[PDB]
């Protein structure tokens, strides 16, 4: 109240020192940063062929959540549970010598070299396929190959995320061969919700080119010429 006073700082040209603002655009990045940013632009600026542009059309997150729920309890064998299973088969084999104790252990297969043999033999029933495989040619045949062999496929977001299902870092493809019978109506419920968007659209998704959009600083001045051209008429 008595002495405390406002004392503002003029920040125009030729007055007090400009305060420490954000500056997060105008910062000289390392060259591993701008190599990493200029090529994300450069998949948006070149004309991307429709074989690469099979991707960027992935499943929406309500469908990927149901799909990872269905793929959760088909989780493969890890080495902790590989110990006790080789007990539990053989401790009863020491005690009863069962001719067949287990009829069907079901699992989801993983690996592009594994899934490929399943599709062309038509053993797989749903092919989740990744998004960001670093040499894209490791995967690009397989949406074209799932169509001809009639096996349904679906593009999910992130090769890291389905790699966590298999207790690994990335796994790039999983496939459903032998699902449980009581839960077939959860695998078959989402397959027409999937093969609408991937198999049946293959006559159209093979025509659709990608990329070829200019930057916002240059697609604005195209529009500023057109807004002049709309004023040139009216």
């Amino acid at each position: 109240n008595p002495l405390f006073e406002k004392r503002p700082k003029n920040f125009g040209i030729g007055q007090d020192i400009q305060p420490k603002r954000d500056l997060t655009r105008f910062v000289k990045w390392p060259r591993y940063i701008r190599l990493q940013r200029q090529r994300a632009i450069l998949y948006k600026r070149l004309k991307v062929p429709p074989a690469i542009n099979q991707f960027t059309q992935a499943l929406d997150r309500q469908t990927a959540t149901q799909l990872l729920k269905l793929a959760h309890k088909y989780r493969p064998e890890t080495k902790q549970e590989k110990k006790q299973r080789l007990l539990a088969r053989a401790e009863k084999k020491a005690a009863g010598k069962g001719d067949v104790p287990t009829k069907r252990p079901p699992v989801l297969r993983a690996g592009v070299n594994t899934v490929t043999t399943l599709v062309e033999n038509k053993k797989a029933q749903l092919v989740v396929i990744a998004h960001d495989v670093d040499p894209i040619e490791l995967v690009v045949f397989l949406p074209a190959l799932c169509r001809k062999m009639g096996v349904p496929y679906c593009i999910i977001k992130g090769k890291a995320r389905l790699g966590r299902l298999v207790h690994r870092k990335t796994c790039t493809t999983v496939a459903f061969t032998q699902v449980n019978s009581e839960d077939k109506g959860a695998l078959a419920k989402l397959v027409e919700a999937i093969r609408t968007n991937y198999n049946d659209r293959y006559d159209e998704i093979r025509r659709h080119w990608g990329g070829n959009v200019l930057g916002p600083k240059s697609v604005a001045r195209i529009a500023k010429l057109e807004k002049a051209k709309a004023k040139e008429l009216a």
Partner: protein, 252 residues
């Protein structure tokens, strides 16, 4: 067989410039937000002398907009500026002498020194003593102005090439004769190693294309083609004419 004097200047052992007692590159200050959009105030503290330059320089200090600091530029000093003078710099700078401002805003027929040949170049054209350039013919669409270089060549430049109003100080320097061999020695002792120039006629055939003979004559025509190799380009290089001049130039 021996290489000639003109070829030995490019390696630069004893033919480098004498760049010790010089004071720095005379450059206009680098552009930022202030000179693009307003003006910035600067005061000139001293008027100095480069060795080997006949133009004097001026050292101008500027209040930094970002750091609490002052910082010092070196200008090609326009003529008629003094110490303790305010120099203003930028787009909304007022056209007085010594101020530096874009050529797209100053009107036609103004007299300009130290202008950029491309935006950001910090001053390249008309920097020697007595020189200036005139602006003519603005073009507001496809923003580009033309200027008149001190060689009489008209040249189109950008609209935003930043440039200081006025003529360079030190003009009239070539009106006094050197008048004796010693003052040409001190003139080039501060610049380079080029001054005692032996005529190529007065040497041996190893040392020049024109040397030799029992008389001092050239023998071959002194005009050479432009694709002539290094070692033969001596004399009048790719000349369009010779002899004492008729007219002023009469050829673009």
């Amino acid at each position: 067989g021996r290489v000639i004097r003109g070829q030995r200047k490019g390696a630069g052992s004893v033919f480098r410039a004498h760049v010790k007692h010089r004071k720095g590159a005379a450059r206009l200050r680098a552009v930022d937000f202030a000179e693009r959009h307003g003006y910035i105030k600067g005061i000139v503290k001293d008027i100095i002398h480069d060795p080997g330059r006949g133009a004097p320089l001026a050292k101008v200090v500027f209040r930094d907009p970002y750091r609490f600091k002052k910082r010092t530029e070196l200008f090609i000093a326009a003529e008629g500026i003094h110490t303790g003078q305010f120099v203003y710099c930028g787009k909304k700078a007022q056209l007085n002498i010594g101020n530096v401002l874009p050529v797209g805003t100053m009107p036609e027929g103004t007299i300009v020194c130290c202008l950029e040949e491309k935006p950001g170049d910090r001053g390249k054209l008309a920097r020697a003593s007595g020189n200036y350039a005139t602006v003519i013919s603005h073009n507001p669409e496809t923003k580009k102005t033309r200027v008149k270089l001190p060689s009489g060549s008209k040249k189109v430049i950008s609209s935003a090439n930043r440039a200081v109003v006025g003529v360079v100080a030190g003009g009239g320097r070539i009106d006094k004769p050197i008048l004796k061999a010693g003052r040409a020695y001190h003139k080039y002792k501060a610049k380079r190693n080029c001054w005692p120039r032996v005529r190529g006629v007065a040497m041996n055939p190893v040392e020049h294309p024109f040397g030799g003979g029992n008389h001092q004559h050239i023998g071959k025509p002194s005009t050479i083609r432009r694709d002539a190799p290094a070692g033969r380009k001596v004399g009048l290089i790719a000349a369009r004419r010779t002899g004492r001049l008729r007219g002023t130039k009469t050829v673009q």
